[PDB]
Amino acid sequence: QEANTLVIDLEPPAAFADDQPQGHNIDVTVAKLHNIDPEDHERIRALQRNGVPSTISEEQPHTARTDATGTATITNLPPGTYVIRDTNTTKPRFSPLVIPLGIDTTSPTMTLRPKLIDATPGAPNV
Structure with a gap:
């Protein structure tokens, strides 16, 4: 049972x-796709740009939180595509993004x- 980990970084990485x-x-x-x-x-x-x-x-749907550095960590995501949008309309850091995961029985x-x-706007648009 390989653990499923999804990491989305929209900025140069450096967790040090x-x-x-x-x-x-x-x-x-x-929102799984x-x-x-x-x-x-x-x-x-x-869809990364269009949403x-x-x-x-x-x-x-699942919920999670992200940093202002365009980074985010989410787990428990079975194979398929994912939808990620910035819920915090107060200070949007990213627009709706799509990330695929090795489509298969194994995760x-x-x-x-x-x-x-x-x-342009989108997630905070509405």
Whole structure:
């Protein structure tokens, strides 16, 4: 039973001198997405900037918190794609992002550091 760990970093990583690990002032919404292979990078990046609409089939939602450094840590995520948006509209740090996970029966760990460019409001938009 391999543990499933998902790490999302939108800024240069450095969990040492820097306080990157610290930062729970931002709330994030997690919404599983219909199982999609990670190979379709165009598909992911397309939704990384555009975001995932509610029209897409999503599993039970999960909650978590992220730091102001664009970093976040979430576990217990079975294979498939994930939806992450900044709930804290007070100080939004990131826009809706999509991260795929090795589609399979087994649940592997995935560590990624997505690099997105400001795509106008969205999460805090509504």
